[PDB]
Design a protein around this ligand. Structure first.
Ligand code: ADP
Ligand code: T2F
Ligand code: T5L
Ligand code: MG
Ligand code: MG
Length: 259
């Protein structure tokens, strides 16, 4: 059992939907970590308290070098506190903003780390459902770590939940979905890492929705044939058509540019 009194709080690491994440140090051990602070009132207002227990329950039981660790949790009269592994090199989101786009080698490496973490996840029938650059953190060696299990569930799920940019058609239409949702988000990520923006991006939610439903996207000329092949294979309206993660890892373009 932990209390807030056990940690020295540092700077904010990032903004959340239901609070903020802070850098922190555990007083007795000097263990540097991240504290994801959530407000009870806002969670209650949204009726997401059940889903927060699920984020904790799912993430605490995962052990993989490419998945962010959740060490524990505690709560007080006003807040819920998630004790996370601190990712010192920040988000893939911030790296993409400064670099504009990644080269094929950096993209393929990230796709490999993601595919390994996802393979491990799906082995436990865990669907992340919120795979996006702001939820992909970087370890001390620059290795990708899947974070933010806030929308995580066990497959299959029929459970409903913007922006729609990373969501597959079946999730967008409120239909039943499985592990294939993360294979779709992988294709969206691969495209965004190479192009600098996701394939269904738009000025409005309405326009993005139509693009995802139609699987309506085009590649800029600089996107190679091997990158086009893997992305096109991953972005299939039909979840059944989406390849297994094993095939993603053995894709010629992945093996040639990773790691
Ligand atoms: N362990 C961590 N180390 C470093 N930065 C983090 C960590 N966890 C979260 N962040 C930062 O805080 C942001 C919000 O955290 P996240 O868990 O994704 O919250 P939410 O569910 O509100 O989206 C992230 O996008 C990232 O910028
Ligand atoms: C009022 C209250 C309690 C409580 O006192 O039992 C617990 C939680 C809560 C704690 C931990 C986790 Cl992981 C999830 C929910 C939440 C969330 C919103 N209101 C809450
Ligand atoms: O961790 C959270 O802030 C939330 C818990 C409840 C479900 C949604 C989730 C999120 O936005 O990631
Ligand atoms: Mg997040
Ligand atoms: Mg979240």
């Amino acid at each position: 059992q932990w209390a807030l009194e056990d940690f020295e709080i540092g700077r904010p690491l990032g903004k959340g939907k239901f609070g903020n994440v802070y850098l922190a140090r555990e007083k007795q051990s000097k263990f540097i970590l991240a504290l994801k602070v959530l407000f009870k009132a806002q969670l209650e207002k949204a009726g997401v308290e059940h889903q927060l227990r699920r984020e904790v329950e799912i993430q605490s039981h995962l052990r993989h070098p490419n998945i962010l660790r959740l060490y524990g949790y505690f709560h007080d009269a006003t807040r819920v506190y998630l004790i996370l592994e601190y990712a010192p090199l920040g988000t893939v989101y911030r790296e993409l903003q400064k670099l504009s786009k990644f080269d094929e080698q950096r993209t393929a490496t990230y796709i490999t780390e993601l595919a390994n973490a996802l393979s491990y996840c799906h082995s436990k029938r865990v669907i992340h459902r919120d795979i996006k650059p702001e939820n992909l953190l970087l370890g001390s060696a620059g290795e990708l770590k899947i974070a933010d299990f806030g929308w995580s569930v066990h497959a299959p799920s029929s459970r409903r939940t913007g922006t729609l940019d990373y969501l597959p058609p079946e999730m967008i239409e409120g239909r039943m979905h499985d592990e294939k949702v993360d294979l779709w988000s992988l294709g969206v990520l691969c495209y965004e890492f190479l192009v600098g923006k996701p394939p269904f991006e738009a000025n409005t939610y309405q326009e993005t929705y139509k693009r995802i439903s139609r699987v309506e996207f085009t590649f800029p000329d600089f996107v190679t044939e091997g990158a086009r092949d893997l992305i096109s294979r991953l972005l299939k309206h039909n979840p059944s058509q989406r390849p297994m993660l094993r095939e993603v890892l053995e894709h010629p373009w992945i093996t040639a540019n990773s790691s």
